[model samples]
Target: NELDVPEQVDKLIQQATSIERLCQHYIGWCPFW
Candidate 1:
């Protein structure tokens, strides 16, 4: 409960999106982004 939820989510989401974007290119057209 004391954790910084916003900042935690921000980094997680940020990395997630980065991976997602790269996934497409890496997979040469991913099914899900």
Candidate 2:
């Protein structure tokens, strides 16, 4: 169960990373960056 949850976390991280890239491209900056 714990290992399975890590896969979900990895997916979420990947999604968040893609979103971050998009936001950076759209805004030319990311506040957190």
Candidate 3:
């Protein structure tokens, strides 16, 4: 499988990590640190 990403998608993914972390925080403990 290929994981190539365009620039905007990559940026969104990067920006969305905060949301993802908050999701994990509210839903479950995230071992992201």
User: If scored against the real structure, what TM-score would every candidate get?
Assistant: 0.32, 0.34, 0.39
Which sequence of candidate numbers ranks them by TM-score, best first? Answer: 3, 2, 1
Q: What lDDT does each candidate get? A: 0.65, 0.68, 0.68
TM-score of 2: 0.34
- Backbone clashes in model 2, listed as residue pairs: none
Q: Give the range where candidate 1 is weakest over 10 consecutive residues by summed lDDT.
A: 24-33
Q: What does candidate 1's lDDT look like per residue over 1-33, in tens digits?
A: 866567866786767776667776676554543
- Candidate 2 lDDT at 18 equals 72
lDDT of 1 at 30: 45
Residue runs of model 3 more than 4 Å from their true location after superposition: 1-5, 28-33
Q: Name the lDDT of candidate 1.
A: 0.65
1 or 2, greater by TM-score: 2
Q: Could you tell me the lDDT of residue 18 within candidate 1?
A: 68
How well does candidate 3 score on lDDT at residue 3? 75
| Candidate 1 colliding pairs | none
